[PDB]
Amino acid sequence: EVETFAFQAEIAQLMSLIINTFYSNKEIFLRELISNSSDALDKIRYESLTDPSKLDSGKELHINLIPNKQDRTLTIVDTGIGMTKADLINNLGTIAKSGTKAFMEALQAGADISMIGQFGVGFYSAYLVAEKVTVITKHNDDEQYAWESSAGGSFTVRTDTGEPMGRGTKVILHLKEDQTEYLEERRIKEIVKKHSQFIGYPITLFVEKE
Ligand SMILES: C/C=C/Cn1c(Cc2cc(OC)c(OC)c(OC)c2)nc2c(N)ncnc21
């Protein structure tokens, strides 16, 4: 049962800008996604101090980076707070509308795409390198969902029947053909060291088997 939704026009416009603008410094996507994971980990950690049972779905707070050359995917996994169905369809986008407007205006005033994170829409920097983004996510007291979009104005949400996560989020980047450098160990290591070296959770970079 797959549901298809239209992005708000402003968000579709942002995604088109990210896809169409000539901008070579694409590597900043990884910092943005790791930052998002860190924020989600911060949130479940904070909530767990007044309700310890929120960690019944898993106590370990960390981030995995998993490249797969066969699937041409880079996956960012965290055991953070996860996202609800309401998040995925309505609430994140409602928040994102104002950040998008502010970001657009900042760009026209001379800012560049690397500053996208300040506006709360850094998630969409994924489309610098991914033709399709699949997000598997599990929040306490909600089901496991798969969100997906190849841009073009729409996204899908379905209940996920894949491998159950206890809690957290997997952002699966289906990389563009010319962006496979982000599957290479030395490249990912370089980027993490450059932009994410003080993140307060373990970041495990998996090695490709093949
Ligand atoms: C400020 C938005 C936070 C939501 N969020 C994102 C980024 C994000 C995901 C989204 O959906 C997967 C978004 O809507 C499509 C979105 O809109 C700005 C942002 N990553 C994560 C994550 N790893 N864990 C828990 N929440 C997250």
PDB file of N, CA and C and ligand atoms in Angstrom, residues 7 36-37 40 78 81-83 88 92-93 96 120-121 123-124 135 147 169 171, ligand 1:
ATOM      1  N   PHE A   7       4.892  17.294  -2.885  1.00  0.00           N
ATOM      2  CA  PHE A   7       5.556  18.299  -2.071  1.00  0.00           C
ATOM      3  C   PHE A   7       4.818  19.622  -2.177  1.00  0.00           C
ATOM      4  N   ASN A  36      22.071  15.769  11.002  1.00  0.00           N
ATOM      5  CA  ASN A  36      20.682  15.396  11.251  1.00  0.00           C
ATOM      6  C   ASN A  36      20.598  14.188  12.177  1.00  0.00           C
ATOM      7  N   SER A  37      21.464  13.212  11.934  1.00  0.00           N
ATOM      8  CA  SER A  37      21.536  12.038  12.796  1.00  0.00           C
ATOM      9  C   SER A  37      21.922  12.428  14.222  1.00  0.00           C
ATOM     10  N   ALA A  40      19.059  13.926  16.010  1.00  0.00           N
ATOM     11  CA  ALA A  40      18.079  12.909  16.374  1.00  0.00           C
ATOM     12  C   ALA A  40      18.537  12.092  17.579  1.00  0.00           C
ATOM     13  N   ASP A  78      21.286   5.850  11.817  1.00  0.00           N
ATOM     14  CA  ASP A  78      21.420   6.264  13.211  1.00  0.00           C
ATOM     15  C   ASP A  78      20.382   5.586  14.082  1.00  0.00           C
ATOM     16  N   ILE A  81      15.973   9.424  17.389  1.00  0.00           N
ATOM     17  CA  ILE A  81      14.565   9.405  17.774  1.00  0.00           C
ATOM     18  C   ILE A  81      13.636   8.862  16.675  1.00  0.00           C
ATOM     19  N   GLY A  82      14.091   8.882  15.425  1.00  0.00           N
ATOM     20  CA  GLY A  82      13.241   8.450  14.322  1.00  0.00           C
ATOM     21  C   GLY A  82      12.165   9.471  13.957  1.00  0.00           C
ATOM     22  N   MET A  83      11.362   9.143  12.945  1.00  0.00           N
ATOM     23  CA  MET A  83      10.308  10.044  12.470  1.00  0.00           C
ATOM     24  C   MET A  83       8.972   9.320  12.400  1.00  0.00           C
ATOM     25  N   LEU A  88       6.701  12.701   8.400  1.00  0.00           N
ATOM     26  CA  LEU A  88       7.073  12.454   7.012  1.00  0.00           C
ATOM     27  C   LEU A  88       6.135  13.110   6.013  1.00  0.00           C
ATOM     28  N   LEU A  92       7.315  17.892   9.072  1.00  0.00           N
ATOM     29  CA  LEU A  92       8.640  18.357   8.668  1.00  0.00           C
ATOM     30  C   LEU A  92       8.546  19.387   7.545  1.00  0.00           C
ATOM     31  N   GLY A  93       7.634  19.156   6.606  1.00  0.00           N
ATOM     32  CA  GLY A  93       7.449  20.068   5.491  1.00  0.00           C
ATOM     33  C   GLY A  93       6.862  21.398   5.909  1.00  0.00           C
ATOM     34  N   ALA A  96       9.650  23.215   7.251  1.00  0.00           N
ATOM     35  CA  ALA A  96      10.609  23.483   6.190  1.00  0.00           C
ATOM     36  C   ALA A  96      10.217  24.626   5.253  1.00  0.00           C
ATOM     37  N   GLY A 120      17.581  24.678   8.126  1.00  0.00           N
ATOM     38  CA  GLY A 120      16.796  23.524   8.520  1.00  0.00           C
ATOM     39  C   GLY A 120      16.407  22.594   7.398  1.00  0.00           C
ATOM     40  N   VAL A 121      16.930  22.855   6.205  1.00  0.00           N
ATOM     41  CA  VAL A 121      16.570  22.059   5.039  1.00  0.00           C
ATOM     42  C   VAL A 121      17.789  21.333   4.466  1.00  0.00           C
ATOM     43  N   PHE A 123      18.698  18.368   4.859  1.00  0.00           N
ATOM     44  CA  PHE A 123      18.313  17.061   4.317  1.00  0.00           C
ATOM     45  C   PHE A 123      18.343  17.065   2.792  1.00  0.00           C
ATOM     46  N   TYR A 124      17.830  18.139   2.195  1.00  0.00           N
ATOM     47  CA  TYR A 124      17.660  18.144   0.753  1.00  0.00           C
ATOM     48  C   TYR A 124      18.978  18.286  -0.009  1.00  0.00           C
ATOM     49  N   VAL A 135      14.222   6.724   2.770  1.00  0.00           N
ATOM     50  CA  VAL A 135      14.424   6.898   4.202  1.00  0.00           C
ATOM     51  C   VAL A 135      13.589   5.870   4.943  1.00  0.00           C
ATOM     52  N   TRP A 147       9.959   6.283   3.411  1.00  0.00           N
ATOM     53  CA  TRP A 147       9.739   7.490   2.635  1.00  0.00           C
ATOM     54  C   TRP A 147      10.651   7.424   1.435  1.00  0.00           C
ATOM     55  N   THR A 169      16.815   5.875  12.110  1.00  0.00           N
ATOM     56  CA  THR A 169      16.612   6.257  10.723  1.00  0.00           C
ATOM     57  C   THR A 169      17.750   5.765   9.852  1.00  0.00           C
ATOM     58  N   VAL A 171      19.051   6.669   6.045  1.00  0.00           N
ATOM     59  CA  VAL A 171      18.917   7.452   4.825  1.00  0.00           C
ATOM     60  C   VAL A 171      19.731   6.773   3.742  1.00  0.00           C
TER      61      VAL A 171
HETATM   62  C1  LIG B   1      14.700  19.336  10.706  1.00  0.00           C
HETATM   63  C2  LIG B   1      14.150  18.019  10.149  1.00  0.00           C
HETATM   64  C3  LIG B   1      14.499  16.761  10.924  1.00  0.00           C
HETATM   65  C4  LIG B   1      13.917  15.453  10.349  1.00  0.00           C
HETATM   66  N1  LIG B   1      15.051  14.514  10.142  1.00  0.00           N
HETATM   67  C5  LIG B   1      15.911  14.466   9.137  1.00  0.00           C
HETATM   68  C6  LIG B   1      15.916  15.438   7.948  1.00  0.00           C
HETATM   69  C7  LIG B   1      14.682  15.485   7.206  1.00  0.00           C
HETATM   70  C8  LIG B   1      13.994  14.319   6.825  1.00  0.00           C
HETATM   71  C9  LIG B   1      12.807  14.418   6.085  1.00  0.00           C
HETATM   72  O1  LIG B   1      12.074  13.334   5.691  1.00  0.00           O
HETATM   73  C10 LIG B   1      12.770  12.095   5.733  1.00  0.00           C
HETATM   74  C11 LIG B   1      12.321  15.670   5.729  1.00  0.00           C
HETATM   75  O2  LIG B   1      11.140  15.832   5.025  1.00  0.00           O
HETATM   76  C12 LIG B   1      11.134  15.220   3.735  1.00  0.00           C
HETATM   77  C13 LIG B   1      12.988  16.818   6.107  1.00  0.00           C
HETATM   78  O3  LIG B   1      12.415  17.995   5.701  1.00  0.00           O
HETATM   79  C14 LIG B   1      13.196  19.168   6.000  1.00  0.00           C
HETATM   80  C15 LIG B   1      14.170  16.733   6.840  1.00  0.00           C
HETATM   81  N2  LIG B   1      16.785  13.474   9.326  1.00  0.00           N
HETATM   82  C16 LIG B   1      16.449  12.870  10.489  1.00  0.00           C
HETATM   83  C17 LIG B   1      16.957  11.827  11.208  1.00  0.00           C
HETATM   84  N3  LIG B   1      18.037  11.156  10.784  1.00  0.00           N
HETATM   85  N4  LIG B   1      16.362  11.450  12.339  1.00  0.00           N
HETATM   86  C18 LIG B   1      15.248  12.107  12.827  1.00  0.00           C
HETATM   87  N5  LIG B   1      14.752  13.187  12.121  1.00  0.00           N
HETATM   88  C19 LIG B   1      15.369  13.527  10.977  1.00  0.00           C
END
